[PDB]
Each structure stands twice: as C-alpha cells, then as structure tokens.
Design a protein around this ligand. Structure first.
Ligand code: HEC
Length: 99
C-alpha cells in the first residue's frame, strides 16, 4: 500500500525496465498492472511468456516477482526475486500509480 517505498523497490527493476514507455532488456512497465501478459507489441518475448496468457493481475504480479521462473518457467527475465510480501505489495502500489 506504500508507493513511496515501492519506488525504492523499483531500483531492482530499473536496470532492465523503464516507466517512460521505452523498451529495452525488458518491456516498459508503465501500465503493466492488468495488462495482457506478453501484450507489448514489438517486444521480443520468450516463448513461455507468449504462451502464458491472462493479465498481470496484482496476484499474478506478486507471485511472479517472488520467483519469475516458478510462474513462467523458461522466462528470459533473470531476476533473483523479492522474498518480502511488503516489498512486492509496495512495488505493485507504485506501479499502479504509473498506470
Ligand atoms: C533484467 C536483468 C531484468 C530485471 C532486473 C527485471 N526484469 Fe522484468 N523482464 C526482463 C525481461 C528480459 C523480460 C521478458 C521476459 C520474457 O520471458 O519474455 C521481463 C518481463 C517482465 C514482466 C512481464 C511484462 C509483460 O509485458 O508481460 C514483468 C511484469 C516484469 N518483467 C517485472 C519486473 C519487475 C517489477 C522487476 C523488478 C522487481 C523486474 N521485472 C526486473 C528483464 C528483467
């Protein structure tokens, strides 16, 4: 529920993701909440990500951020994970503000 704290957590995402609409190592994350999984046109998603389906609901996002490869096995997103539920919740709150 704390976007200010979530903003700090995003420091762990900025190396590959932007919130300005630009795509790089990873797709832009501004507007990601509720967004179609593998829904950014032009971005070269892995096959498992494209086969996943569904939307990036708060629950799907929080699980994915805890362990990317457990949620989308074979994803090309190389990230250790956020083991603290508060960090995940705060980060999601922050992203929701950038919808
Ligand atoms: C680069 C080393 C990354 C870091 C650090 C984080 N992410 Fe990432 N992410 C990256 C790639 C290469 C991809 C594509 C994965 C694939 O298999 O195709 C992604 C993807 C995501 C997605 C899905 C986006 C979509 O449009 O479907 C999400 C929701 C996402 N990444 C979130 C995320 C956050 C919040 C991070 C910091 C905690 C984070 N990523 C770090 C590469 C990298």
């Amino acid at each position: 529920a704390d976007p200010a704290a979530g903003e700090k957590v995003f420091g762990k995402c900025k190396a590959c993701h932007k919130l300005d609409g630009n795509d790089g190592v990873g797709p832009h994350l501004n507007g990601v909440v509720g967004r179609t999984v593998a829904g950014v046109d032009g971005f070269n998603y892995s096959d498992p990500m494209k086969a996943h389906g569904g939307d990036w609901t708060p629950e799907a996002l929080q699980e994915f951020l805890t362990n990317p490869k457990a949620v989308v096995k074979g994803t090309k997103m190389a990230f250790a994970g956020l083991p603290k539920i508060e960090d995940r919740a705060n980060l999601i709150a922050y992203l929701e503000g950038q919808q």
